[PDB]
Amino acid sequence: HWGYGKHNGPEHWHKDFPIAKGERQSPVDIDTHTAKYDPSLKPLSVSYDQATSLRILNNGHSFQVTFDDSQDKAVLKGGPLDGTYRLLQFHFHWGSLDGQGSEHTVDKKKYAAELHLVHWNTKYGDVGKAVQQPDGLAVLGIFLKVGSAKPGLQKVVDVLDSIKTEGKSADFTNFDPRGLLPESLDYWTYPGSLTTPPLAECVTWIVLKEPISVSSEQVLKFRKLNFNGEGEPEELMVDNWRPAQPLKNRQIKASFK
Ligand SMILES: NS(=O)(=O)c1ccc(NS(=O)(=O)CCNC(=O)Nc2ccccc2)cc1
Ligand SMILES: [Zn+2]
């Protein structure tokens, strides 16, 4: 089964998921010399005020926080998107050291981590039908750099000790994802894929220009998680990122000049 190690990592994934070698795979490097401003892009509309978090869990490849997506509580709208996209979950990708961890890169620069806020297109009814559609999902990607502490992340960090190993989960209600956003909503966008199996090409990616700053204290707590379940041999969850994939025939557009 898949992971990020030598024997099951991203170089192996195409054997079970041949779309790994597809025409619109994610992540990509964002070259600011060729990711051109497009004046037709609209401002991004983030409506998370009624977001209802449910649980936080270690699934053996990251930790994710889940939400109640049964109504239009927390939705992503505007930007490059047509229609309305409900927030399903968020999770992160991070490194074995501050110098790497992000999935997207900017002019080949790797950030310490990357946050993925995952949304699905409500015109398809549920997410299982949305993932079969080229416009089924919208993932809001936010880079993390090491600096001052991000107060909106602290509730997450303070609970990670309770989900150290794969399969553990915890109650995680009343978490406000507005606390994970940077100041600016300037973004890049391109059509792409899930960055983990099944790597489906169903994602409109929206990557924010401005990283959020998290403290070294905070990101170190990510690196205490385990890929393995309890009683299994410890394998620390670090470097759980897929490297940049070829942009091929795609365009990346910027909402800003
Ligand atoms: N790293 S990333 O590119 O942002 C990313 C984001 C999400 C995923 N995986 S996912 O499961 O959440 C996809 C959405 N959920 C489903 O399709 N669920 C489903 C499917 C069939 C039946 C019933 C439910 C992987 C990578
Ligand atoms: Zn992700």
Q: Please indicate if the annotation marks 195 as binding a ligand.
A: yes
Rg, Å, the chain Cα set: 17
131 neighbors 121 (Cβ within 8 angstroms)? no
Helix (H/G/I), strand (E/B), else coil: 13:
helix
Residue 62's alpha-carbon distances to 41, 57, 183, in angstroms, are 32, 8, 25
Ligand 2 centroid from CA 111, angstroms: 14
The residues that are catalytic are: 61
One-letter-per-residue 3-state SS of 194-255 = CCCCCCCCCEEEEEECCCEEECHHHHHHHCCCECCCCCCCCCECCCCCCCCCCCCCCCCEEC
CB-based contacts of 39: which residues, under 8 Å, 6+ apart? none
Domain span at 114: 1-257
Does residue 139 have its Cβ closer than 6 Å to ligand 1?
yes
Measured in whole angstroms, the distance separating CA 46 from the mean position of its chain's CA atoms is 16
Phi, psi dihedrals of residue 218, rounded to the nearest 5°? -70, -50
Does residue 131 have its Cβ closer than 6 Å to ligand 1?
yes
Q: Please indicate if the annotation marks 196 as binding a ligand.
A: yes
Residues linked to residue 139 through DSSP beta bridges, in sequence order: 118, 205
Ligand 1 centroid from CA 217, angstroms: 30
Number of compact structural domains in the chain:
1
Does residue 242 have its Cβ closer than 6 Å to ligand 1?
no
For 147, other C-beta atoms within 10 Å of its C-beta total 13
- Please spell the DSSP secondary structure of 153-197, one letter per residue: GHHHHTTGGGG-STT-EEE--S--GGGG--S---EEEEEE--SST
CB-based contacts of 2: which residues, under 8 Å, 6+ apart? 8, 9, 12, 13, 16, 61, 196, 197
Method: X-ray
